[PDB]
Amino acid sequence: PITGLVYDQRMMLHHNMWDSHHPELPQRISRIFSRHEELRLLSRCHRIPARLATEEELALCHSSKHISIIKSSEHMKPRDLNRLGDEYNSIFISNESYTCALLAAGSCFNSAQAILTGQVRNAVAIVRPPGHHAEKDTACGFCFFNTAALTARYAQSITRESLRVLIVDWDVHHGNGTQHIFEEDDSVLYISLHRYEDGAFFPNSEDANYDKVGLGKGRGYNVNIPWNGGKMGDPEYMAAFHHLVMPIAREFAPELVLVSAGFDAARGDPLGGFQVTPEGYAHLTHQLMSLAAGRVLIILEGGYNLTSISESMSMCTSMLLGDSPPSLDHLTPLKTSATVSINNVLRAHAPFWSSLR
Ligand SMILES: O=C(NO)c1ccc(CNC(=O)c2cccnc2C(F)(F)F)cc1
Numbered sequence: 001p002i003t004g005l006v007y008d009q010r011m012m013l014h015h016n017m018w019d020s021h022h023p024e025l026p027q028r029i030s031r032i033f034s035r036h037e038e039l040r041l042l043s044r045c046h047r048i049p050a051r052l053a054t055e056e057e058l059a060l061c062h063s064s065k066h067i068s069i070i071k072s073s074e075h076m077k078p079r080d081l082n083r084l085g086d087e088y089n090s091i092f093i094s095n096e097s098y099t100c101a102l103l104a105a106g107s108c109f110n111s112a113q114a115i116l117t118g119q120v121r122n123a124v125a126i127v128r129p130p131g132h133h134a135e136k137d138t139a140c141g142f143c144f145f146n147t148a149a150l151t152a153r154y155a156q157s158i159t160r161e162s163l164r165v166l167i168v169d170w171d172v173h174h175g176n177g178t179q180h181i182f183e184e185d186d187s188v189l190y191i192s193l194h195r196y197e198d199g200a201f202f203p204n205s206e207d208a209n210y211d212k213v214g215l216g217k218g219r220g221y222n223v224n225i226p227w228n229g230g231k232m233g234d235p236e237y238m239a240a241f242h243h244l245v246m247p248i249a250r251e252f253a254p255e256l257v258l259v260s261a262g263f264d265a266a267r268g269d270p271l272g273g274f275q276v277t278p279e280g281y282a283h284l285t286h287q288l289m290s291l292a293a294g295r296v297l298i299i300l301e302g303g304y305n306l307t308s309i310s311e312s313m314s315m316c317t318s319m320l321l322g323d324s325p326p327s328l329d330h331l332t333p334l335k336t337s338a339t340v341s342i343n344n345v346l347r348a349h350a351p352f353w354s355s356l357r
């Protein structure tokens with residue numbers, strides 16, 4: 001019963017040359033790592049090394065053009081870096097960005113491989129830059145390559161093509177990139193919880209609404225749980241897990257669970273405006289550990305309050321290590337719009353999941 005951990009300070013080298021205070025900070029990953037040390041969690045884990053994703057591995061989800069452009073940025077002077085970055089929605093690029101994104105993905109490949117070969121039962125990946133906004137053909141929202149989507153395909157490549165992978169994306173933002181990559185795929189179930197505000201929240205697309213259920217053979221295999229009009233927290237996320245995430249996940253019966261674990265829905269985050277607590281994230285982790293025979297890989301996405309994300313991700317690792325869940329607060333009645341949101345998703349996915357009927 002071993003928990004893997006991957007962290008490599010080389011991923012701090014990616015940085016914003018023009019705004020050194022940009023929230024997607026190098027110290028995001030070092031602060032999470034430090035908190036694991038501080039809580040004496042690090043020594044309880046088995047350290048998994050980082051590695052570079054190969055270009056062939058990036059092609060599991062990304063176009064050769066997109067790979068080539070980000071790859072070319074390694075050699076750019078700052079004037080191309082700034083101008084190239086401004087071509088995307090919410091991206092900054094430094095000469096080290098490409099290599100850091102490669103290390104983020106390869107770190108997660110090594111972690112999935114250790115899980116799937118039985119070297120560890122579960123694992124945590126303290127990586128940046130994030131991935132879930134990255135599309136097949138473009139970078140977006142601080143993300144260059146879709147780490148979680150790539151890891152799902154890498155997992156299938158070392159097991160069998162039809163390996164059932166569940167991606168639970170609890171970053172406060174919609175993982176537009178991962179939704180699109182798997183939208184026609186029934187082997188990868190995508191479930192995202194996200195602040196939506198009727199499309200008035202990044203990434204500002206009705207793609208994130210509850211009625212986007214997947215396409216083709218993927219109908220039913222894309223689950224968007226969109227929050228509107230309310231400062232959501234533990235009671236809403238627990239209710240969403242009880243009524244939607246866990247019933248659908250159990251019916252799907254995944255063989256591997258990946259968490260796109262952004263911590264920007266956390267109390268204190270400067271961007272998300274929500275109030276999920278560290279003990280809330282612990283309970284969400286503990287629930288997912290009941291799936292896939294415990295084969296869970298937690299992948300850092302967003303989250304910008306350094307103290308909040310360090311406490312929150314550490315509590316997740318504590319759960320992976322087998323510690324008992326901390327006690328939740330009394331739990332207020334749901335925000336009424338949260339009930340509306342949950343019921344809209346239930347109506348949207350009742351055609352496909354009998355456990356919701
Ligand atoms: O991945 C993410 N969260 O996990 C993520 C991705 C994209 C955005 C969009 N941009 C902004 O909100 C924005 C606008 C102006 C000034 N500063 C910002 C800031 F950097 F703070 F976000 C936000 C969050």
Ligand SMILES: [K+]
Pocket residue numbers: 169170171172173174175192193194
């Ligand atoms: K999300």
Ligand SMILES: [K+]
Pocket residue numbers: 182183184185186188189190214218221222
């Ligand atoms: K899907």
Ligand SMILES: [Zn+2]
Pocket residue numbers: 171172173262264301302303
């Ligand atoms: Zn986010």
